[PDB]
């Protein structure tokens, strides 16, 4: 057990190991507050997050366990990993606070764009890394579910990492696939490919692609580009009311993407066409995208690793708050730090 030192910031007690110094409140939310600090062990700055009452309810306890299990499993150059996880508690009996530590990479995609105009090269490398980390993630049967520019950290060398996975079950909505946004059916990994598509388009034209004011307004902007649903997709929509509303819409034909992204790399326009397909079963997968001509200068099959098996059977267990809490404690207890470089 390291030596802890406790201090009060923004009216919140932070008790952490002495290795973390000069803690600076970076922000807060209903999830927990986050502090910026310098990690004297790696010599790198980091993000220290203190969870907000991890075990308030069965729901929260389980959600806490899911986040911890997910972060511990993530080991890839393009995905944020768990640098450290700790609790000042000396036993389960007193276990109550959970602290998560991750790398502070530089800036999110939005802050990059706001600073400079990107070259087609940058977009290539950026989208490539996104798909590279996504390939890793999807191979583990994990779906991020909330990809957007704010969840993309980029460093000075244009290197990228995916952060903040969606754990729950305008902005966000603008990069969401339609089957999710309106709960049309059980969705698959390709929802993230839909997000990548929206993000790529924005980087190329400097404009949000589907900035709808509300769900209906967005669905219309979307269906106007890709065309209205066909019978094949319709039969997949489980909601009878949903199907009913779709059929009520005035049919629309898919647009020629070349006519929307004038002046962009023909290869990037092709890739977009492949990602922005309305039927999720027809969208290109992460692995498939890495092999697309647009990324010819960065693609390397021997350097696009998949992940180990990720066991999610826990999602279907019905446990007591304290069982979920003890499970979480066990995970904290068994955490092995990443090799020092």
């Amino acid at each position: 057990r390291p030596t802890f030192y406790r201090q009060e910031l923004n009216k919140t007690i932070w008790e952490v190991p002495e290795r973390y110094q000069n803690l600076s409140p970076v922000g807060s939310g209903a999830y927990g507050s986050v502090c910026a600090a310098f990690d004297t062990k790696t010599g790198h700055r980091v993000a220290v997050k203190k969870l907000s009452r991890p075990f308030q309810s069965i729901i929260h306890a389980k959600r806490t366990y899911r986040e911890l299990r997910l972060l511990k499993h993530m080991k890839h150059e393009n995905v944020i990993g768990l640098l450290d996880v700790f609790t000042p508690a000396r036993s389960l009996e007193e276990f109550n606070d959970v602290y998560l530590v991750t790398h502070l990479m530089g800036a999110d995609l939005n802050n990059i764009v706001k600073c400079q105009k990107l070259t087609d090269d940058h977009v290539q490398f950026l989208i490539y890394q996104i798909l590279r980390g996504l390939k890793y993630i999807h191979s583990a049967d994990i779906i991020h579910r909330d990809l957007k520019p704010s969840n993309l950290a980029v460093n000075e060398d244009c290197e990228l990492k995916i952060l903040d996975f969606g754990l729950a079950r305008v902005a966000t909505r603008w990069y969401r696939a339609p089957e999710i946004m309106l709960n049309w059916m059980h969705y698959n990994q390709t929802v993230d490919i839909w997000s990548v598509g929206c993000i790529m388009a924005e980087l190329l034209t400097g404009r949000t692609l589907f900035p709808g004011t509300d769900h209906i307004d967005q669905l219309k902007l979307i269906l106007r580009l890709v065309g209205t649903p066909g019978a094949e997709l319709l039969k997949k929509i489980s909601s009878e009311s949903a199907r009913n509303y779709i059929q009520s819409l005035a049919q629309m034909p898919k647009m020629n993407f070349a006519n929307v992204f004038i002046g962009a790399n023909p290869l990037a326009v092709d890739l977009l066409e492949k990602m922005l397909v309305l039927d999720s079963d027809k969208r290109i997968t992460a692995a498939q995208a890495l092999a697309h001509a647009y990324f010819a200068q960065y693609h390397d099959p021997d350097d696009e690793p998949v992940a180990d098996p990720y066991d999610q059977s826990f999602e279907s267990r019905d446990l007591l708050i304290d069982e979920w809490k003890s499970l979480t404690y066990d995970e904290v207890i068994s955490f092995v730090p990443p090799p020092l470089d």
């Binding site: 800036a107 990059i112 706001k114 600073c115 090269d121 940058h122 460093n155 000075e156 060398d157 244009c158």
Partner: peptide
């Protein structure tokens, strides 16, 4: 590794 550079805001 790719010879790309980006400016990081303060």
């Amino acid at each position: 590794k790719p010879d790309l550079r980006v400016v990081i805001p303060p």
